[PDB]
Amino acid sequence: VVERLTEVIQRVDHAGNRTEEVIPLDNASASEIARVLESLT
């Protein structure tokens, strides 16, 4: 029974995986796009 809850959690611990990435911007200003994309949500 512990086996599953090593299974469940460390499978569920995958589900909420949150990683960050830097996307460059060749034309638009990053400060605009940061206001626009944050006005949606």
Place this chain on the structure above:
Amino acid sequence: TAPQDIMQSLQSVIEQLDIRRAQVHVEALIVEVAEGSNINFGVQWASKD
């Protein structure tokens, strides 16, 4: 000095305001032709008393 968006605007303005100017050669011509004349003819007398 501006953000990446405003810059790309101000580069297309400066590119279009940087054009080569033409120069002009302005001649004036001031002409004047004058022609005068006059004529004067008359007799006069005098005498004693």
